[PDB]
Amino acid sequence: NEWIPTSGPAWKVPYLENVVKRSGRRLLAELRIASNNGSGDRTFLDDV
Amino acid sequence: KTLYNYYSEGPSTPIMPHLVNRLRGLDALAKIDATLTKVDMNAAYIFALRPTFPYSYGYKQRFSNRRLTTSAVCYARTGLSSFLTVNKTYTSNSPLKGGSRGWPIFNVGVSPHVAEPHMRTLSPIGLEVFSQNLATFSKTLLTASSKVFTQSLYTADILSIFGEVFLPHVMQPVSNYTPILVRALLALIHILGPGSGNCSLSSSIFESSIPQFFTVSHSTNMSNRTRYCLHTWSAYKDMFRNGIPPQSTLPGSSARVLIPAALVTSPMFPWLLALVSSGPQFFLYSKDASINTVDIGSRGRITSPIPDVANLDLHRLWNLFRFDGHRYIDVVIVGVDRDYVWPYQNGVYVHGGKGPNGTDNYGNADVHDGIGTIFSSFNDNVNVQTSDLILGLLTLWNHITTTYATEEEVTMAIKIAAAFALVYPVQPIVYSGCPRAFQSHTSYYQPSSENCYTTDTAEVKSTWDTVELSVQVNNAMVLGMTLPFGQPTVSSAQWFNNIDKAEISMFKVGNLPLQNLDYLSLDMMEFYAPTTGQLYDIRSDNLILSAHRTVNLGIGYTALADFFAYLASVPAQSFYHDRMVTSPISKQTYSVYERFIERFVDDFVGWDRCDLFNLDTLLAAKRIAGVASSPIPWHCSLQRCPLPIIMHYTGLHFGQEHITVRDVAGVEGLQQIVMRNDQGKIVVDALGTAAPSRLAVKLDWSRLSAWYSDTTCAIPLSDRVMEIINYAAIWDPTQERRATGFVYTYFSPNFLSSFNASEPIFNTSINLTPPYDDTSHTVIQNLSMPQMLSFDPYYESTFYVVSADNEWIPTSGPAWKVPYLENVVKRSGRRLLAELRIASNNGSGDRTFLDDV
Question: How far is residue B428's CA from residue B746's CA, in Å, rounded to a whole number?
Fold first, then answer.
């Protein structure tokens, strides 16, 4: 009864959140396949 | 209004009306829900006599990456709940840890002023007598009307015997009952004990809870006893010619009370003979002090019973007071036979009742010395449960308030009893010393302390506690204890080596009005019509609620007294044992403290000031013989309550918003302090800031708060070096050596560890150590009033807060640990539990069904 439940926790309370954060290797792959994609089948065979 | 409204408002320029209205409003907020008294007696006691006063506090530094306390919550309490002395059988001369060698006796006399009686309406018998003696007769010796001539004018042949006796009061029906209500309140509060739970000179000894068992004790030399004579109505009539005098004679017989035989058996009767007599006719102790006393450490550890508790006595505050009432009382008892047996003590024979050897119509009116001879419940060695010793007081208060008294009398009794409600120890004060750079400009260079006394050895003692409780130190500390208004004592008692002796001085600490027993007899014989329905306050009929009101009023009285002492610039050393030998400035400060107290009492209490506060005990100091005053300047005001309670009652604000950061660019707000020597060389030339004057504080009350932010440092625990001394000092032009330090009042680390509990209960399972913080392990707290704005009571001069090396600029703000306080609204867990039990889940049946009224 020293601690009142309405007053909130007196211990270590964790808190979580979902975050949008890509990895370094994912960004590296994105750079390799989109930014610096030369190919030739996408530069020339794009009229479809 | 609520506490949220009062905590959001501060003092105003007309300050006496503000303080008085604030105190009245706070009195209006003292509710304890009397239904609780019928379910939880102990919780009601704790809530009524030991108020909590929650507050929040923190520290703030400027250039530190260390993490200190920011918003901690504590609960501040004031006053001594009981007293610890050596037991009567202690023979040795060695000092005991926390056990005093004698307690003070706050002796109260008889007030020359008589409480003004208000009108009363006569009962049908009283109205019969009134319309009888007012009727026109024709004397004529044929009839009995002529018996006032042929026989003495005190004849009962025209009126009745009772009508003849009560003729003057039948002619003028008046009554007043505050003198007995004051004593009832004082008796309850002193028996149970209000305050913080501290019960000794040391600030580490505490009471585990409100006691549950008392022990009576008799002392011929120390008790203030009165003489009782017991008769019967028929036997009392036969003493005189044929009827008893309307006015009682001189010799006992100084007072007379008429009790119907149906009211003698009530539990209120022994407490009715008391509370009008002179006390204390008997002394009360805690039954076994080894189970109601604990020791609190610096960090908060509550240890096993007191190291030398086997040689200690736990006096109640009942033993610390002395009242002057009636010295001779005639108990009459009307409506009883000649075989009446006294139902309260074996071997006591009522005059006109049963005799010793089965005889009838006992012929001797024996005089009994002290209420302990009769009323075997008050015998020499009697163990008494708390409930059955307080039940009589409760019944007496309820009956008198709901039958014979009015609301005004109850309020007056509460306010008067609030003045004698609490007892405080000597004020402990520290002294930071002075910066080294001013070593040649000081008379008080070394840091020091005064009246700092703790006895716990489980943890590390603070460096400021250096008091060794010797005999002379014990006497000096005993003669420093004060009432809420600041009145000390010069009387004392000592029960040591099986020898008991009391030294009572002619100078009393106060006076209480005497209770007229004629009104008592008239009401209890139903000559006056009862005053039923003249109690519009719901708390005025219980006693416990009323006692809570007077305890709160007394704490308000002491808070306002400390605030007035700061306002009137009254040093804390004017209330020690050497207040009269040190320097006449004590009386010069009294000459303003008296004006402040007189205005407050004339504006709030409504009673005569000379009954509640004089200078008599202050001006009769004894100084002892071999106790030397510590080298401390008289810069600290009189203070017995910590800062949070003071700002609760007065409305002061000391938050963190008054601490400045202020990267300094210009010269605004700064002064240059120069001291040139004989040949013209400049030796000081320091930066300083001007301390505010009381006039500026009157026109701007925030200036005081900022003042508190400019000269306050957190007191260290293990070292005698305060960081404020590393940066700043006080420059006083009116001192021969102008440089000086800071004083502050210091309570104890243990007394503040006791503030970590929401309620004053500490046995073993309470955790007074604050977890996850650890800051209190090095810095204690600063709950003191700020430095006194004037060191002269009559003439105003400006002193300065000066820098020590000019590296720190005073305008830039403090560079030390600055504390900040705030009053917070935070109920306790047990208080909420009681509120749930008495309001949310109250079934009863008398409130579900008997609600139509």
Answer: 6
Cβ-proximal residues to B545 (8 Å cutoff; 6+ apart), any chain: B30, B31, B32, B34, B37, B48, B539
Q: Is B144 exposed, middle or buried (0-12, 13-18, 19+ CB in 10 A)?
A: middle
Element spanning B27, H or E: helix B15-27
- Looking at CA atoms only, how far is residue B834 from chain A in angstroms? 11
Contact A2 B832 (CB under 8 A): no
For the four alpha carbons of B146, B148, B152 and B158, in that order, the dihedral sign comes to positive
Segments in B675-828 forming alpha helices (H): 694-699, 702-711, 749-753
CA–CA distance, B538 with B276 (Å, rounded to integer): 26
Length of chain B as a residue count:
853
Q: Name the residue among B314, B318, B311 with its Cα closest to residue B293.
A: B314
Q: Are B38 and B58 in contact (CB under 8 A)?
A: no
Q: Looking up tokens 């030294």, which residue turns up?
A: B503
Chain A with chain B: Cβ pairs closer than 8 A:
11
Question: Could you please report the per-residue DSSP string of B773-801?
Answer: T-GGGTB----S----S-SSSSS----EE
CA distance B108 to B181: 16
User: Residues 739..758 of B with a Cβ closer than 8 Å to A: which?
Assistant: 757-758
Cβ of B658: how many Cβ atoms within 10 Å? Answer: 18
Contact (CB, 8 A) for B800 and B660: no
CA pseudo-torsion sign B238, B240, B242, B243 = negative
- The pair of structure tokens assigned to B510 is 């106060």
Cβ atoms of B550 and B484 closer than 8 Å = no
Q: Which residues contact B506 (CB under 8 A, 6 or more apart)?
A: none
* Amino acid (one-letter) located at B242: N
Residues in chain A: 48
Q: Are B226 and B327 in contact (CB under 8 A)?
A: yes
Contact B360, B463 (CB under 8 A): no
Closest-CA residue of chain B to A2: B829
Closest CA to B216 of B399, B385, B394: B385
| B767/A1 touch (CB, cutoff 8 Å), yes or no | no
Residue-wise burial string across B105-140, b where 16 or more C-beta atoms lie within 10 A, e elsewhere: bbbbbbbeeebeeeebebbebbeebbeeeeeeeeee
Phi, psi of B396 (to 5 degrees): -60, -50
Token pair, residue B307, equals: 């190291």
**Contact list, A2 vs chain B (CB under 8 Å):** 757-758, 766-767, 829
Contact status of A1 with chain B (Cβ, < 8 Å): yes
- Does the distance separating the beta carbons of A4 and B757 come in below 8 Å? no
Beta bridge partners of B730: B740, B801
Q: Where are the beta strands (DSSP E) in B177-290?
A: 205-207, 213-217, 227-230, 255-257, 283-286
Burial of A12 per CB tally in 10 Å (0-12, 13-18, 19+): exposed
What tokens does B361 get?
């119509």
* Contact criterion met (CB below 8 Å) for B351 and B366: yes
- Crossing angle of helices B407-417/B178-192, nearest 10°? 40
What angle separates helix B407-417 from helix B544-567, to the nearest 10 degrees?
50
Give A20→chain B minimum CA distance, Å. 32
Question: Cα separation of B585 and B595, whole Å?
Answer: 16
Sign of the Cα torsion B459, B821, B570, B674 reads positive
Task: Please check whether residue A9 touches B, CB under 8 A.
Answer: no
Helix (H) / strand (E) element for B78: namely none
Strands B328-331 and B227-230: parallel
